């Protein structure tokens, strides 16, 4: 496959970075097959894109029937009842105070993008506040909202005004909830007025930021100041959504609820679909024709996104996600005594991660974290990187992993840490 | 259905407007079936996305075959062979001087968005110039690039700086090529320096602008303008691309070649995929990791794109387009004499349109466009509106439409213009 | 001590970004006469760029400044106010072309004046948008550079510039741009760039200063007034250069039946002293909260005292009528020189804001060289002339309105001789 | 009584946006003494907000301005230059702490100076980024408001604001904010807001003026210089308020071994006249092309003549040490007052830029009411005190460095007494 590696280097730009050396041929559940027969259990699931697994039999049958019905029709002209079919369901499952309304789009960056458009149309305000280490997409506005410059926005500036970043709460790094809230106070006193901020966008637990959970200390306080200053709270559950946090949405772990929320990735279980759900009054702010997109709500994707929403419940992967999470929680917790480089492990449900620090100084180092990288797939196990420094392994296995599938990779994960 | 629509209003926001309120059941080539089994000839193809028709036997077989393989990988992690030489297949076919390289994404707005990121990474310049009436997407950057405020960006401002709009040459409306070039010179002397403009983006034929073809002298001068000031000429062929204009890409009708090209819509023939092609060195300007997207290069959509390029070649849809549109153009000019409202008949290939003005004045009638919209509606024929005044009908039938199906629709079209 | 020594010391001590036009350095100035450090007497047709309509060191202005010099030179008005600030504001409120009650705030520079007009407009409407016109000049600060409609050289190298700022086309039917063309550009901005319900103000000069002395037609101004009336936009008139008797009236807006919502004043406001101001409808001016407006030097006591005498000199010496008398005589000469000099393509202006445009006869393409040759020969004859326009082919005549009749006659003789050569 | 008729006139004729601290109007000022129109004599501890380090109407400054009145008041330097501009730039180049050859460009207002500083930095680096600190104040223009780190009341209602402008945290160990706290706030801006190689300049005051007189530590200024050296950033020191003998040295940056790339000057640079300047490395200053920098009032000849005399006064009267002597005596009084005044939480400053911060004794919470109480009590006893700070709980002391010691001792007697009550 070495010749195809170079066939790509001369046909697709260097900007599309790719981690693993080998290509894909077939995928099942959480097991990937290379071109050369190698079998690797997927602890990545394409970045939380397949909570219900690679090619789950139900929605693969739901996309097959949806195929010979219609593949595309542009919902803006000819609508389909499968669009209203899901908008009904998520409006009943989303943690939004009062009546909820849902619009669907294609990519997750478009969901956060449209949440900004709806937040701006309802508030009439320009301001948008995110947090350091937060990731919200790769388009112009979403890169501005993203809190990691390299490599996400290196060389694509300048970026629009009225967008600033607070500090995300993180007791593991010595920043408290008060430290986080004070950075917001410093933005209101130096950057932009509170009555000029349209929305505060927030990952319930940060995805590419290092799997750091926001405390209920932070959320209830956050809900308070936006209610004071007329700001809308937006929860970005593109990565944390759909049963991986032990519950359907990570915001269900909290008592107060966001006015808007963006969803994608495993929302369709491996097919291009995003969406925005929120309060009926705020979502109804843009005028007709203001929201759209050609591929918005791909009929095959809404059919699968309907399907995972049945695997949601009959398989009950919310309860399983807490059972997978808590055991791998234990595997790395006595590996903590065996492997000294572990400084902390964190996660809710099975959205779990482990941070590794070099012993001489407690600074990160991604090449011990990334020493585990190679040993894992050397054993046929694909683990993804994370963090502001690259020092955190995030475990993104599908929720549909058989238990023998899991314990294999778990004890293989026991061998990567002591070598 | 009556309940079906009102279920749709309480579940989905008013922002996502919809044209027809009959909901699709079935789709095949250029035929659409609705809740009541009523057969409608499709002259929209979901906005030029189904150039090869609804569910083409070749691309479904390529899509169903890819679903036996895998759902999705996040190309960023484990890549495909599907991705690479679909790009090799477009690198040789795209009108790009010298070696070409191709990256793939999902939505057309993303392709335009990434074409800007590549233009910014290559030139280090912030500036971007588009034209009034142009449409480039609905995200923050693409809304600023779009040259129509209503309804695509009412309530979503403020918009970023260094984005200005020239005037598109509309020789059928008093705007010459010299007028259009002077608008660009006026931007250079008042808005932003030329050596600060990274790219000039335009559609070879304005899609929602009214199907205004760009004259050859305007494109030649545009090439020399960017050549003189180090600007990159981006061609937005998301709507004009893939055999609709008689040739593969609309830029092939000109001797000048753009530095960058954006594609989507009929690229995958009813599946979510976009892409950017251009000179090898400029597209490699972004750093590894700067370009990305989780759904980018969807395996099924890549397999669908592979067969779409097969279909238009073996079925000779490039040559078919112009003979479909030539037959359409002459029955429009036959009705030109006994109908008083036709003021112009624009189009190239099968990207044809006809503009209506009120007979007593020169103040266009959307109603007459809606009235003729309301006649083919009750007569089983779906066509779209466009133009800055909503007074021109665009003919976006699938190129795969059978001859008897087309001859019927033109008959129906002739009757609705007379009355 | 000597000029070239000073020129070298200048280039080694100051940055090249501060360009200098003339070879010589000033030693003494009075009315419309300049004496360089070598004794050469120069007829000033620039007046510090339309700053000394009342002439250099007018006795009444100097006597007013010398008097204020024995009281106080600065107290920071936002800390300790003074009567002269209030009285000058009252005088401006009466004379300003403002519909209804007016209020005035004083600042230091014309760019600060435009800046505070923008700030006032944004506070009242709550909207980001601002629309100017190509060829407009409104200052060199970040926002005023964005408002300025000439990239070279005011904006080269200082980008990127803020959003919600766009430029229409200023009408000059002497170039093929009608009022209808100008309004078409505005409606194109409204349909492509920014919605009219998001534009706070439209800003234009009644006569474009360095834009070539192009006069806004009443056609254009009335349409702008109704357009802003319909879409809730504020009409800001930048009279920094046109203001104070330059155009035959105290303010160039008085030539029109249309009144602006806000107006910026500077340059000739203080007759050679640092002062600027904003006057407008009281309801609009009161939009910013206490503390939102200011500036340390704003309303300098010496400059406010000077502006008091300037308004006095304009009235007591009838300088508005003088500007019309002088300008009519100037257009008389420039148009007689039309028969003897084919390069003259246009003679435009109002009052003593007169200009002449030059083309190369071969085609209708500007001749900036012929413009420079006229400047150099006038300098050779001791006459300082400023160029302007988008192509540098326009010579503007900014003589002080107090220029003696005999000196003006000699300058016109120099003008006729230079135009034939 | 008679001031009330003037206040009603002031309220009806000028907008409410120009706030006014004192309800009395000045009639005469001299050194550090103010006389209102009612005969009341006030000791000036404001000096027009640090504009009069040399005092109100200093004899040598007035005689220099009066000499310039008999020659010329304005020619626009970009048209006809003058020698005094060059010689003042030559003096500023020799005196400014700039590594290597320096160049100086003069403008009018402090905001204009900062505005041209970013224009020079943007032209030199080609980068859009600008980083300031919360609590910083740099002017009231659109760009300087964005750079200003205090939203109320400076930018309330004037947004939206331009991108590529972010605010770090200014170090104040008295507030629990270390230098490490400050440095890492910059790295978070690098990691989340804008790449370091896209930041054109980091701008800071050596001592925050309106921010509460918080002095930058030496290790913070050092790491800032290293930060900019690594990433090609330019270091800009804003010495509009700290400049010219206020801090015990001619420039506050001279208290450090670090030298900035650019420096802005205003306020007391001309000792009570509208003048501002930008001095920096010659290579950096020459980045803007000819015609890119300017301003009609820039380098006002009267204000330049005053600044020439201000420099002579600072040297002839040894005002740098006098500022150190007056500031030490003030800190002694304030520290002795701390016992019978539990509200005093801190005594900050350097030289004669000393301030005192007040806290409500129950919780360490600011008490602007107590601060205003000290202000109003001192005003009743004839002492004019200003407030600063992010929370308005800081009183700053900006007496003219030329204040007579008997009047200074008297002012300290009042200050002591209004603090014991």
From TrEMBL, chains C, D:
<dbReference type="InterPro" id="IPR015424">
    <property type="entry name" value="PyrdxlP-dep_Trfase"/>
</dbReference>
<dbReference type="GO" id="GO:0042802">
    <property type="term" value="F:identical protein binding"/>
</dbReference>
<dbReference type="GO" id="GO:0034386">
    <property type="term" value="F:4-aminobutyrate:2-oxoglutarate transaminase activity"/>
</dbReference>
<keyword id="KW-0663">Pyridoxal phosphate</keyword>
<dbReference type="GO" id="GO:0009448">
    <property type="term" value="P:gamma-aminobutyric acid metabolic process"/>
</dbReference>
<dbReference type="InterPro" id="IPR015421">
    <property type="entry name" value="PyrdxlP-dep_Trfase_major"/>
</dbReference>
<comment type="similarity">
    <text>Belongs to the class-III pyridoxal-phosphate-dependent aminotransferase family.</text>
</comment>
<dbReference type="InterPro" id="IPR005814">
    <property type="entry name" value="Aminotrans_3"/>
</dbReference>
<dbReference type="InterPro" id="IPR015422">
    <property type="entry name" value="PyrdxlP-dep_Trfase_small"/>
</dbReference>
<protein>
    <submittedName>
        <fullName>4-aminobutyrate aminotransferase</fullName>
        <ecNumber>2.6.1.19</ecNumber>
    </submittedName>
</protein>
<dbReference type="InterPro" id="IPR049704">
    <property type="entry name" value="Aminotrans_3_PPA_site"/>
</dbReference>
<keyword id="KW-0032">Aminotransferase</keyword>
<keyword id="KW-0808">Transferase</keyword>
<dbReference type="InterPro" id="IPR050103">
    <property type="entry name" value="Class-III_PLP-dep_AT"/>
</dbReference>
<dbReference type="InterPro" id="IPR004632">
    <property type="entry name" value="4NH2But_aminotransferase_bac"/>
</dbReference>
<dbReference type="Pfam" id="PF00202">
    <property type="entry name" value="Aminotran_3"/>
</dbReference>
<dbReference type="GO" id="GO:0030170">
    <property type="term" value="F:pyridoxal phosphate binding"/>
</dbReference>
